[PDB]
């Protein structure tokens, strides 16, 4: 069955990929080559062109992503050649550096060797390459609660966090054949962070908030033509709401709205005062202001939705069906001020795509 | 087929309704009576208890409604006895008066005679009993654009609006056997309106905004045990966002955000300033403040979501499956500040319920 799944996915992908690349006549010969290779080896190897366009298609097909207008400019780094943990580590450090690009963030994916028999070659434990640790003991909460389980797993492996609210987690990944993952501390010179200040409210700096510049999702599987690249970290730039309306605002994350209300000088006593809503707006203004002031790329949800409208128009004009997840595409503040809120989207799954996979901790 | 649909729906409803009312032993005899009556007459007549509990179940099952905690306190007015347009008119005036209740709004439904052979007895044209007219001609836009088609239909029937931004539409409905609907101007003494002012920003009154106190949906069909009550207007009180984030804010409604930005003293030039979001928050604070100041019932979206959480808990504790439409339940501002955003809901349709029906104009 598994070979048949591979071949079917391969045929669909090569046909579509080569159509898009004007390579349509080459399909027949390529598929034969692939067919032989699957027969003989149990798998097949993507050309560099296939891998690159595959990763770009996968982004284009990510229903939950509002940033898809820019799918065709994804910077694809082919690291199928890595064999050692030092090579993996250095490839991850390199991804951080080149994606960060001194603040002018470059959307990038680094692709490691794919699963073989469903056997991973490299297993990345981080949710994002750069993320803050979380701790909870004896009613005492420090840092990012969403990182508690991974932080605990790291501290099993000999790492120790400083227990600041913003400890950078080490990179943590396991190689095929190894029983335990290894971990490496992130060089601070590689990691851009932005202090949060407000354009008009000087007191806002009293909250001592900061966030990291580049969100690099490192625990999803890229699937292309039936090949499973479980290790393939990718990044864009942030939409400000991800930081201001969720990471710093959710009760189960940094939970800062009451403190924000206090520094902006409003009471946090009555639901009818909409103090949470006002605090959310000021916090979100502060996030955008701060990233802009430091020269780190970011987009606001209005501009992002306008770009997404262009993606919709481009899809139509190219004759491609659009898919989307309305529940993720709407921004978490003022969603009815965007066109997204007022239309519907077909949530069908099209491949290539990025998929969730089980965590090796938990 | 139609008789069989009726009987099947009847059996399901009577069984469930009588279980809820502790009337379980009476089911067998009631169903026999109904069975005979369907056989002989092609239909059956609800007892007052059935009609009342049916309307309450229908509210309880309205997936899109965040206000459902209070389903059991619905005030049900049985007007199956009306036969004339004066009786219908007076029943609608009465609903306005008793639902309004001097500002302490009482959730109410008035139920008119049901469809017979799919033949309506009374056909209400209004979307809500109280709503503002809309006009568009020669690039000139006045009032509520959502009311343009109904306003035009009314002006075909000899009515003429003053072309203020807030003209009250007349009640408009058609009786079985009549070719045209009739219309009646709303007595202004019956209609409470609220001027919009802001708690701290005196200039806000310069916008001369107002809205009406009571939203009375008058174009949906109540279906109970296979009986189709196409004319059955109902009301709750407003959630403030319906007015501040949608009616007064949508570009295709009153479209007031740019004017709001100006009176609150912020620039409306840059997406990154989040001026739309800030304007939305102040407008929404103003709506709640103004309704409260005038002694007209209203709920904010935080309190509403807290009440809805209690509805969820009550459903579970009573052993009833909960259904909901996440896309309608989330409020249009700060939705991620409510628990609703962070869980999912089964959008299955359960009857009794309220349904859309085709408009007789358009
Ligand atoms: C270029 C700037 C980008 C922006 C502004 C952007 C924006 C977003 C946002 C706001 C989300 C919602 C996620 C959340 O609420 O946590 C998202 C989800 C997602 N984005 Fe993008 N994105 C960008 C680039 C990318 C790239 C380069 C890829 C892959 C190559 C990608 C793939 C995805 C995927 C797979 C999800 C869903 C993740 C999940 O289900 O957890 N995005 N995007
Ligand atoms: C008591 C106060 C009530 C509140 C605060 C409330 C709140 C809401 C809100 C905010 C909506 C969203 C509608 C929109 O965006 O236009 C809604 C929808 C709805 N509500 Fe309620 N509601 C209440 C009472 C009622 C009552 C008494 C009924 C019926 C007996 C009802 C039935 C519905 C229905 C059927 C919808 C969906 C309408 C549609 O699909 O267009 N609600 N409710
Ligand atoms: C099981 N994984 C959960 C996925 N979720 C909920 C998820 C959580 C967080 C956080 N914090 C962040 C994301 C990433 C969203 C994203 C990805 C990229 C490439 C760019 C961007 N601006 N945002 C996804
Ligand atoms: C085809 N009908 C469209 C239904 N829609 C979109 C719809 C539009 C408007 C407006 N303006 C208002 C509603 C009513 C929502 C409602 C109903 C009740 C009983 C109480 C309440 N607070 N809100 C529904
Ligand atoms: C297309 C989309 O489902 C549509 O905009 C819905 C979304 N959620 C909503 N929610 C409410 N309460 N009211 C609405 O009119 C809408 N519009
Ligand atoms: C249960 C619900 O689907 C869940 O809260 C989703 C809703 N929409 C979202 N949208 C984005 N962009 N990110 C999220 O984490 C979520 N959470
Ligand atoms: Cl994030
Ligand atoms: Cl309304």
From Swiss-Prot, chains A, B:
| EC id | 1.14.14.47
The cofactor remark states: Tetrahydrobiopterin (H4B). Can also use tetrahydrofolate (THF) in place of tetrahydrobiopterin (H4B) but binds THF with much lower affinity than H4B.
Supply the source organism for this entry.
Answer: Bacillus subtilis (strain 168)
Note from the entry: This protein is similar to the oxygenase domain of eukaryotic nitric oxide synthases but lacks the reductase domain which, in eukaryotes, is responsible for transfer of electrons to the ferric heme during nitric oxide synthesis.
Q: Which family does it belong to?
A: Belongs to the NOS family. Bacterial NOS oxygenase subfamily.
**SUPFAM superfamilies attached here?**
Nitric oxide (NO) synthase oxygenase domain
Per UniProt, which keywords does this protein have?
Heme, Iron, Metal-binding, Oxidoreductase
Instruction: Note the subunit structure.
Output: Homodimer.
Gene Ontology biological process: nitric oxide biosynthetic process
| UniProt binding sites for heme | 65
Protein's UniProt name: Nitric oxide synthase oxygenase
GO molecular function, one example? heme binding
PROSITE patterns named in the record: NOS
Q: What class of enzyme is it?
A: oxidoreductase
- Reaction catalysed? 3 reduced [flavodoxin] + 2 L-arginine + 4 O2 = 3 oxidized [flavodoxin] + 2 L-citrulline + 2 nitric oxide + 4 H2O + 5 H(+)
Using the record for this protein, list the coiled-coil segments as residue ranges, or answer none.
none
Cofactor(s) needed for function? heme; (6R)-L-erythro-5,6,7,8-tetrahydrobiopterin
